[PDB]
Structure formats: C-alpha cells, structure tokens
C-alpha cells in the first residue's frame, strides 16, 4: 500500500481522537500492524510446506495439518485487526462530520479552528457513538483472545503433534515448523492485545466519571 | 485510493454509507490481506492416491472449475460496477436527495446490485454443493482408473472464509433491499 | 495516485459513448487481467504433465500447443487498443501550442476509432485461429520431435482458463460494437 | 513517474513526442508487463538429456551469456540517458522547444548517440544469438559434458515473438531518429 | 516517507541529527535491501546428515529459536518508539530544547533507548553464544538418534551482517550516552 | 513520487560536476543493480551444483567461495558512498537553523575525500576476495566435510562477469570524477 496514502489515513484518525486515543493508535499501528506485516507474516510462510509427518500414507499430511491448524495464527490476527480498527474508523469520520458542519454553520472560523485544534471533546451525539465504539473494541479483543486460547489450548506451540484422523493409520507423528518462533510472536501479540484492552477500559473510566459523577 | 473512496462517499444516502464500509472494509480487505494467501497452494498441495499421470490435473479441474477467490474477485467487480456508473453519469449531467432522471438511475443501480449479489451466491451453492469444503473428493474422470481418492488443502480454513463471505454478502442484500423500500414507499406514498 | 491522474485525463477529454467505452476497458479488461486472470496462468508450464519418459518432450509439446500465452496475448491487445486513445491526447496538446469533434480533430478522432476496431478484430481473429476455438482441452496429443510416436499431455486448469477466455472475448466484442456506433454517429453528422 | 514523463514530454520537438510514445508504451511497458515473466524460468526449465553433474550449468551459460530481457534493460537505460542528460545540461546553461546556440550541438549529439546505441545493441543481439529466431534444441559439447549433449530451451516460440517485436520497434526508433538528423542538417546547409 | 523523516529531523537536537542518520541509512537500509534476502533460505537450505523424519525441523528450531532479521526488526521497532513517545508529549504541550516536563521526558526517552539497545545486544550474545555463525551444528534433540550433523546456509555472510548490525548498534549506545552527559551537565551539574 | 523528491533535493544543491556524478550513480549504479543485476543472482545457491554425494558439502563449499554476494557487496557500497552526499544536506539544514565557501568548504572537501576512499576500498575488496573480476565456471573444493577435492559449478558465470565488469568500470568513472573535483578545489584554493 502507498506510503503517502498511509499518512493520509493515519493522519485523519490522529487529529480526531482523544489524548488516550492517540496512545492506543500508536500501539495499534507500530506494534500490532508492523509486527504482523514485517516480521510475523514471514514466520508462517512455510507452515504447511515444512510440515513433516512420519508416514507413507497419501493424504495423511493434508488432513493432519488441517486438524491441528483450522485457521492460521496470522489469518486470525489479520481478522482481529480489521474488526478492531473498524469502529475507530467510523468514530473518526463522525468527529470530522461534526467539525465540518460547525465550521460550515458559522460561515452559512478563526475561533472554531482554535478549539478544534485544541482538543477533541466528547459531548452530545458523539457520546453515544464514542462509548459504543470503545465497547465493541473491548468485546472484539476479548472474543479473539478467547478463540486463540480455546482453539490452540494455550499460547505455546508444540514440536510434535499426534494425529489419528482418517486416512492416517493408527497414530502418526507430525512435526511443526518453527514452533519456538511462533510461540514468541504469539505471546507478543497476546500481551500487546491485553495492553490495548487496558487502554480502552481506562478511557471508558474517563467517560463514565464525566457523566455518572457529573450528575 | 482515497480519491476514489471520497467520490463515492460524497454521493450516497444514509444506508449507502453503511453499504460502502461493508463493501470496502470487509469484502475487499479480507480477500486481499487474509483470504488470497489461503488459496495460494490449492493445486500444489492437492494430493491424489494414484500413480496415473495426468489424473491429478483432471480431478482438480473437475472439482474446482473456478477458484473461490476468483469467483469472489469477479463478484466484487460486478457489484461495485453500478456504483461507479452512477458517479460517471452524475458527472455527465453536472458539467452538461435523489429525484428526477437520477431517481431512475439510482433505483436501477440498486436493483442490479441485488441481482448480481444473488446470482453469484446461487452459483456458489450449485457449483460446490454447499458452503462446506470436504477433506476427501472421489474422482473417476478419465484417465483416472476406476475411482481415485484426492485430498484438499486447508479445507477447514477455506470453509471459515467461505462462510464469512456468504454471510457478509447476505447482509449487503438486506441493506440494498432496505434502501429499495425507502425509495418505493416514499415515491408511491 | 498515478493511476487516478492518468484515468482522469482520458476521462475528462472523452465523448458520451467514449466514457462508457473507457469504463469497460479499465474495470473489465484490465482488472480481470490483473487481479484474477494472471494468477490462473501462473502454473501453465509447471503443472503441464506429459505421460512420457523422453527428456525434452514436455518442453516441445507445451511450446507447440501454446506459442504465446493467453495473458500475454491479452496484455499485447490492451496496449495496442489503448495506444490510439493516448495518441489523440498528445497530439491535441501539441496543437495547443500551435468534447466536440470539429476541425482537424475530426480526422484524427475518426482514424483512432477506426484503428481500434481493426486491432480488436485482429487480436480476436488471432485467438480463434491459434487456439482453434475458445475452449481449452484437458488432453493434447503431441507428436513433435523428440517425443516418441504420440504422447498424451494434460493442461493445467483448462476449465478456469475457458471461463476467463469467454469473458475476455465477450467483453472485447462489446467494445467492437461500441466503437461501431461511435463511428456511425460521426458518419451521420457528416453525411447529412 | 508521471512527473518524469511530463517533464520530458514538454521539452521535446514534434517528432520527439512520437519517439517518446514508442519508447515508453511499447518498449518499456511490454518488457515489464509481458516480456519479463516469459523469461522467468529460462534456466529452471532448461532440460538436458544427460546424467553428468554440472553439464546443464555450463551449457545454458554457453548458449545464453546474457538474457534477452537483461540485454533489453541495458538498451533502455543507455538509450534514455542522452535524452535525460540533455535536459540537465539545457537547464544548467539556461539558468546560468526550438534549438538555439549551444542547444543545437547538445541536441544533435544526443540524437547521434542514441542511433549509435540503438545499432550497437541490435548488432549484439544478431551476433550473439546468430539470428532473431530461438531454436528448440541446442547441441552442447563443452566440458564436462561428454561428447555432444542435447538440451531443450523453454518457451522458444514465445521468446521469438517478443524478440521480433522488440527488434522491429527499436528499428522504427532508428528511422525516427535519422529523420530528425535530416530535419536538422537540411536547415543548417540551407542557412 | 520524506515528511515522516522531515518531522523527526526538525524536532531533534544537534547529536540527534547524527543518531537519526545511523538509524535510517544503516540499520533500516541494510535490513531491507541487503540483509532480508540473506536469511530467505535459512531453513530451506538447512541440511542434516540423517534419515530420521522430523529431525531437521527440531534441530533448526533448537539452534534458531528466532531469526536474526526478526530480532533486528523487533529491536528497530522498540528503539524507535521512545523518539515518537517524546513526540506525542511535545505535541500535547503544543495543544495547551528542554523545559520543565520536556527535560523529564527527553532524558527518559534517551535512557529507554540505551536499555533497549543493550537488552537486544545482550539477547543476541546469549542466544547465539557469540556473533559468529558456525558452519556445523551438532544436535541431539528427539527424535534425532544420538547426535546428528547439520549445516547452516551462508554462515559467513550472516556473520558479516551480524558484525555490521552489532557494531552500528554499539555506536548508537555511545551517541545516546554522550548526549545524556550533555543534558546532565546543564541541569544537575549546573546547580 | 518520493524518489523524485529526494533526487530533486540533491540535484538542486550540487556543483556542475556533482550533477554529472549524481547522474552516473542513479542511472547506472542503482537502476542496473535493481532492475537487471539483482535477479541475475537470484538462483546463486539454488543452482549451485556439486559433483558429490556427501551431505553438507554443497553448503560449506558455496560459503567458502562466496562469503558475500556481489549484489550484497554492491548494495553496501552504494549506501556508504551515498551517505556523505546526504550528510552534507542534513548538516546544511541544521546550520541554516551553489558556491563553496566558509566552513562549508571543509565539509564539502571532506565528503568528496570520504567518497574516494569508500569506492577505492570496495573496489579493492572486490578484487582481493574474488581474485579477479571474471567468474569461473568450475571451483575446486577441499573444505570439510567434502572428501578430497570435489567439483562444483557456478550458475550464470558469464552474465555475472558482464555485470561485474560494468559495475567496476562505472565505479572507476566516479573515482575519476571525484578526483577531478578535488583538483578544481585545490587549484582554486592553493594557487589562488
Ligand atoms: C515478548 C517476548 C516473549 C518471549 C517468550 C518466550 C517463551 C518461549 C521460551 O521459553 O523460549 C525459549 C527461548 O526463548 C527465546 O529464544 C526468546 C527469548 C526472547 C527473545 C527476544 C524477544 C523480543 C525456549 O525454551 P523452550 O526449551 O521451552 O523452547 C520452546 C520449544 N518448544
Ligand atoms: C465466521 C465463523 C465461521 C465458523 C464456522 C466455519 C467452520 C464450520 C465447520 C467446523 O465446525 O469446522 C470444524 C472446526 O472448525 C473450527 O473450529 C472453526 C472455528 C473458527 C473460529 C472463528 C474464526 C473467526 C472442523 O471439522 P471438519 O473436519 O468437519 O472441518 C471441515 C473440513 N473438513
Ligand atoms: C463467464 C463465462 C462463463 C460461461 C462459459 C463457461 C464454459 C465452461 C463450462 O461450462 O464449464 C462447465 C462448468 O463451468 C462452470 O460452472 C462455470 C461457471 C462460471 C460462473 C460465472 C463466472 C463444465 O464444463 P466441462 O467440465 O466440460 O469443462 C470443459 C473444459 N475442460
Ligand atoms: C512483430 C510482432 C509479431 C511477430 C509474429 C511472428 C514472430 C515469430 C515467428 C514465428 C511464428 O510465426 O511463430 C509461429 C506461431 O506464430 C505465433 O505464435 C505468432 C503470434 C503473433 C500474434 C500477434 C502478437 C510458431 O511456428 P514455429 O513452430 O515455426 O515457430 C518458430 C519459433 N519456435
Ligand atoms: C564490519 C565488517 C565485518 C567483516 C568481518 C566479518 C567476518 C568475520 C569472519 C571471517 O573472517 O570470515 C572468513 C572470511 O570472511 C571474509 O573474508 C569476509 C570479508 C568481508 C568483506 C567486507 C564487507 C564489508 C570466513 O572464515 P570462516 O569459515 O570462519 O567464516 C565464518 C563461517 N564459518
Ligand atoms: C561492460 C561490458 C563488458 C563485456 C565483456 C565482459 C565479459 C567477458 C567475457 C566475454 O566476452 O563473453 C563473451 C560473450 O560476450 C558477452 O556476453 C558480451 C555482452 C555485452 C552486452 C552489452 C554490454 C563470450 O565469452 P566466452 O564464451 O569465451 O566466456 C567464457 C568465460 N565465462
């Protein structure tokens, strides 16, 4: 993707975010996206090519790999990143929509650009959208973290998997490619995801005290 | 890319904005960044229990006449085409709310998208006999002797992405149908 | 970035039908070739399987039945078809130093439409003659040296290649009709 | 890319616009879009009827000292160099599109250099590959291959088609370049 | 690209100009265009003298828990964030050089970079018992019978780039430490 | 897009000879390495063939005769040579916060002197490491675990030799150009 357009999309969501929202944005891009693109994706390049099974049965390797890896880790991370970034994209354009009409209403200027560049305030219709966007981000993050644990019975990848699905005779020993490196990147992705959950929850505390304690 | 998105985003109703984000963020991105690499080794890792030369080539062709990603890519182009035609036709009248002559073009564009979305979903169901991929396919086409056993690559991952594409495509049908109600009811009442 | 600028220049300086022709050329001819068709032909020779033990038999049999790839033939056709349209813009800018069709622009525009029809018809004719039809076969019988007698060879993804061949041929036939009507519209104005 | 093409396009004569079209649309695009991946498996699919280790390596090297696409890449870089450097030299002298004063010498030399570069590479293509037609079979007897070994080329017919197209297109550029030489020499002699 | 570097270039001290040059023109440039292709066949060309299935997989994983390029990519990302961390706090004050909170963040960012650079250097030494790659690795992990002999791909080229990265990273430590001494002289030693 | 901006900045701040040197580096050193030479070395180890049955003999043999790839050595040389040119712009911008005079005279002279050393050092490394500028078809190998001496064959030795000669010759031109600039500065300083 074009680096110039990468600035445009990153720049647009940067201005239309709260003080904490900029910290969450940095962690999302520098850590979640950059690691997945420049480091993690090449690790899973030979996941099935270097999957070795001690057998002479045709088709045994195909079914055993599919049984133990129903969906790849990188594919799961890619889906989670899209699901998490989408609510932030919608709430960012809503802020620009309200900022544009307020400037348009004044004309139809110098003061309105001062307050908009000062800080991003959540009030009115923005309160419902921004709160819901945070709520969906926490749910999406927890759901994918739960899926990772249930599907792969932990965050540690094993060197050897025992497979007994048809057409493999009895139980067949199979060996995973780069289990240690995949474990290291799985832990890094999980830990950073937990940090993103804490930032979203902390932001929710700021909004709640502004309304609940305000009354 | 931002210029193309900006043009379509400017000229749309409230439902149209929701239809755009579902089209761009979901159908295009997961196909580009997630789904396409799943189908990379579809024929390379297609394994058949046989010694007959050429048996693997004809069995893969029989069971996968067109790849899932190729069908999705064709469908995405067809669905997005009427939206681009509206922008081109709108600019034609500008240099030379929806009402007037634009009302018929906008209504027809939604009607075409529903037909294209449903037609491709029908092709997916008929061609592959459901949305779940099997681990084993039994093939008996020439020159394979009798019936041979062949095994698909990543059947479970492909099923997961197939369900995701079908479900999101079904949501787009409902959104387009809903927009067809806000136009027919308003005009006829 | 760069793609938008090139498309905008051609789109702005176009007639009524010519803009309909432009969207067919880009959205269908180019996108199908780029995002779908090119990866279909990726393993055309790697997965070409011949039932023989003769060294070098596979190389000659593939060459005999595929003198040029379908995707390379389509790439050549697209460049040849798009060239007259771009030649009009550069010559028009040259005349600026020196869209209604009047003056010396009439001869260049009419010739550009005329040339595009010939290029589309020529490439369509080449496709039919060279591959004896628009449908790919699963099996090809090859008896070129050094293959002993006649050997059996099997094509990779014949069905998908047939589907994309039909799509490219049918869409190119639409472009031929669109250019004919544009030529007819110009002929009506001058004949009357 | 658009700015680079736009700058050269603006600072050119009438024929120079035509020559720019032939170089970019046909020579560069077809080399990048179509020709480059035709030669992708030139050595991977080079098959020799032998059991001698290392025989395939020396036979391919003997018959293909440099790839056609690599030779065409050097032509495109060398041919386009006088056009770009003439713009820098024009800009340098201007700040310190007819011809006047020193621009006549720089422009005429650039056209002359392009013709020499065009003909030299075409001569290399003919001499090195003894014609523009690629053969299916090559007979190789270099060490360590025992006696004569039969080897088979990958996609000889498709490579022949693109070789003919590149030679013919580059030949057109020679005719267009010498036309500018006649368009300039006739004016100098008349004056 | 240019604007990203332009912003950091205009927001750094005198030594910070040199530090940014070492980070981008050397660490990133070598990794992207020179080093990443050296490690492309790290496991494909890993050869083990054995007939045991699965022995090659476990032996490569044991001796290369994480690739050098992956470790360098993580180090580059971690080292570059404290610079952006101080950039966001600077922008935070703009919505309302060393002064007040800035001195307590710029100094902290420098301290973090030194720790991150030393931590990754320490990890590189301990994990790979030195900065020199060996041609032969002896592996006795299950299921390999007894001890098997395995051979690394391009050990010498990987050693050359490892020395380049380690030495350049060590220079960044000295520059950060030297700049930290400048700040401490002005503030603490100036009391 | 970004490449034009970087080239434009360096071009706008350079001497008359320095603009020629920039052209030789970008047109010949970078472009040929990127679009032509890089893929020539693509199968350098995959197509390296050794006449042996000893496991691991091929790995240690390729490493012995190619400690670093030619393209990797060229890539390092390009980065090292271009660094002083970009360092001048970075230092100039900081000082601001084409005539050569003042303290900038020392920086410009040092940058040219550093470039001459860098090209000379890399040219010396190329000659010593590969005992010449011509690649051999056959390399003899007696490193462990290869038994006795084994025969190994290099991939595309002739094409690599052609590009090696071209890069060395162009590097020598840049050395002469930089030395010429050193003469036009000492004459304007010592004689004047
Ligand atoms: C954040 C980084 C988290 C790293 C967690 C590492 C957990 C796995 C582990 O114990 O790794 C050991 C070596 O670690 C390593 O090689 C990685 C250590 C950290 C490297 C730098 C990360 C940035 C291997 O120990 P083991 O024998 O359990 O190996 C497992 C084979 N099944
Ligand atoms: C959108 C979410 C779609 C989830 C359902 C898709 C998969 C349905 C089939 C299924 O249950 O698969 C079994 C386990 O799958 C799984 O465990 C797939 C779970 C996917 C997690 C959600 C990802 C987001 C494998 O069983 P099988 O062998 O029948 O698989 C079929 C191939 N043979
Ligand atoms: C777009 C053009 C689609 C119509 C032409 C399709 C011709 C091929 C065709 O009918 O193939 C059948 C299945 O294809 C299909 O089912 C193709 C469906 C295309 C869906 C729209 C895209 C099986 O034809 P066959 O098994 O005899 O194939 C003989 C080749 N080897
Ligand atoms: C100028 C651009 C067009 C050049 C076309 C002719 C070039 C190749 C000459 C040989 C020829 O006619 O090829 C026959 C099929 O033609 C083809 O495949 C020519 C297709 C050209 C389509 C338009 C582009 C194969 O016949 P052969 O076996 O004698 O080929 C000998 C090579 N091996
Ligand atoms: C910073 C510059 C780093 C240069 C030194 C790194 C290599 C040190 C080891 C060494 O002398 O390598 C021997 C020859 O290498 C060489 O001759 C490498 C020369 C590199 C030229 C400088 C490139 C810049 C091979 O000997 P070995 O077998 O011990 O190699 C190790 C694998 N086993
Ligand atoms: C700068 C250009 C440098 C050209 C000469 C360098 C290569 C020297 C070897 C040489 O002359 O190769 C010949 C082929 O020429 C070629 O391949 C010359 C191609 C020149 C193209 C334009 C640049 C045949 O040399 P041989 O068959 O005796 O080689 C056996 C040893 N490998």
Q: What DSSP string describes B54-89? A: THHHHHHHHH-SS-HHHHHHHHHHHHHHHHHHHHHH
Check F49 against D54: CB less than 8 A apart.
yes
Ligand 4 centre to CA of E38 (Å) is 41
Ligand 6 centre to CA of F175 (Å) is 24
Size (chain A), residues: 215
Return the ∠ at Cα E88 (arms to E83 and E90), rounded to 5°.
Answer: 90
Distance (Å) from the alpha carbon of C63 to chain D's nearest alpha carbon: 6
Q: Does B113 touch chain C (CB under 8 A)?
A: no
- With CA atoms as reference, report the closest residue to C65 among C168, C156, C165: C156
E138 Cβ partners below 8 Å, 6+ apart?
E147, E148, E149, E150
Number of other CB atoms surrounding residue D93 within 10 Å: 12
Set of chain C residues whose Cβ sits within 8 Å of the Cβ of B85: 23
Ligand 4 centre to CA of D162 (Å) is 9
D72, D166 contact by CB (below 8 A): yes
Using the atom order of ligand 3, give the atom closest to the CA of residue B62: 26
- Give the A:F interface size as CB pairs under 8 Å: 3
F122, F76 contact by CB (below 8 A): yes
Mutate to test the interface with B, among C5, C27, C48 (most CBs of B within 10 A): C27
Check D74 against F156: CB less than 8 A apart.
no
**What is the domain range of residue C24?**
15-190
Enter the tokens of residue A80. 């989670």
User: Is residue A162 in some structural domain?
Assistant: yes
User: What are the two backbone dihedrals, phi and then psi, of residue D98, each rounded to the nearest 5 degrees?
Assistant: -75, 180
C116, C84 contact by CB (below 8 A): yes
Number of other CB atoms surrounding residue F159 within 10 Å: 20
C154: helix, strand or coil: strand
Check A30 against E81: CB less than 8 A apart.
yes
Mutate to test the interface with D, among C63, C96, C123 (most CBs of D within 10 A): C63
Sheet containing D137-140: order of strands? D47-48, D149-152, D137-140
Number of other CB atoms surrounding residue A114 within 10 Å: 9
Q: Which residue has the tokens 């675990």?
A: F145
Size (chain D), residues: 191
Check D57 against F49: CB less than 8 A apart.
yes
* CB burial readout A37-53, b (16+ within 10 A) else e: ebbbebbbeebbebbbb
C2: helix, strand or coil: helix
Ligand 6 touching residue F161 (CB < 6 A): yes
Check C68 against D152: CB less than 8 A apart.
no
Q: Which residue has the tokens 């860098």?
A: F118
C168, B88 contact by CB (below 8 A): no
User: Is residue C2 in some structural domain?
Assistant: no
User: Is residue B102 in some structural domain?
Assistant: yes
Domains identified in chain F, total number: 1
E58, E144 contact by CB (below 8 A): yes
List the residue whose alpha carbon is closest to atom 7 of ligand 3.
C163
Ligand 3 touching residue C163 (CB < 6 A): yes
The pairing of strands D137-140 and C151-154 is unpaired
Q: To what resolution in angstroms was this structure determined?
A: 2.3
* CB burial readout E64-77, b (16+ within 10 A) else e: bbbbbbbbbbbbbb
From the DSSP assignment, how many helices (H) and strands (E) are in chain C? 8, 3
User: Is residue D4 in some structural domain?
Assistant: no
User: Alpha-carbon distance B69 to B35, whole Å?
Assistant: 7
Nearest CA in chain E to F48: E45
Torsion from C-alpha of A89, A95, A96, A97, nearest 10 degrees: 110
Ligand 1 touching residue A152 (CB < 6 A): no
Q: Does B36 touch chain A (CB under 8 A)?
A: no
Ligand 4 touching residue D34 (CB < 6 A): no
> How far is the first Cα of chain A from the last one, in angstroms, to the nearest whole number?
47
The answer for F 2-21 residues in CB contact with A (under 8 A) is: 2
Ligand 1 touching residue E118 (CB < 6 A): no
Beta bridge partners of E150: E48, E137
User: Is residue B34 in some structural domain?
Assistant: yes
Enter the tokens of residue B27. 């159908």
E176 membership: H or E segment, kind and range? helix E155-187
List the residue whose alpha carbon is closest to atom 31 of ligand 5.
E156
User: Is residue E48 in some structural domain?
Assistant: yes
User: Is residue F8 in some structural domain?
Assistant: no
- With CA atoms as reference, report the closest residue to F76 among F26, F16, F142, F121: F121
Using the atom order of ligand 6, give the atom closest to the CA of residue D61: 32
Q: Which residue has the tokens 């999957």?
A: A51
Ligand 6 centre to CA of D128 (Å) is 10
C147 Cβ partners below 8 Å, 6+ apart?
C50, C52, C54, C57, C60, C61
User: Is residue F2 in some structural domain?
Assistant: no
């Amino acid at each position: 993707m074009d680096w110039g357009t990468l600035q445009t999309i990153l720049g647009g969501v940067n201005k239309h975010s709260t003080s904490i929202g900029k910290i969450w944005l940095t962690v999302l891009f520098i850590f979640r996206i950059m690691i997945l693109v420049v480091a993690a994706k090449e690790v899973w390049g030979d996941e099935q090519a270097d999957f070795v099974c001690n057998t002479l049965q045709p088709g045994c390797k195909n079914v055993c790999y599919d049984h133990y890896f129903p969906i790849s880790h990188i594919r799961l991370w890619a889906l989670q990143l899209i699901f998490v970034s989408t609510p932030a994209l919608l709430v960012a354009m809503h802020v620009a929509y309200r900022r544009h009409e307020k400037k348009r209403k004044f004309i139809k200027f110098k003061d309105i650009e001062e307050i908009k560049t000062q800080k991003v305030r959540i009030e009115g219709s923005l309160w419902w959208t921004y709160t819901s966007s945070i709520f969906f981000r926490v749910i999406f993050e927890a759901a994918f973290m739960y899926v990772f644990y249930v599907m792969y019975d932990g965050f540690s990848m094993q060197r050897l998997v025992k497979c007994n699905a048809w057409p493999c005779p009895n139980t067949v020993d199979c060996f995973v490619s780069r289990p240690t490196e995949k474990t290291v990147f799985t832990v890094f992705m999980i830990a950073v995801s937990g940090i993103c959950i804490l930032l979203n929850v902390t932001e929710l505390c700021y909004l709640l005290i502004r309304y609940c304690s305000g009354k």
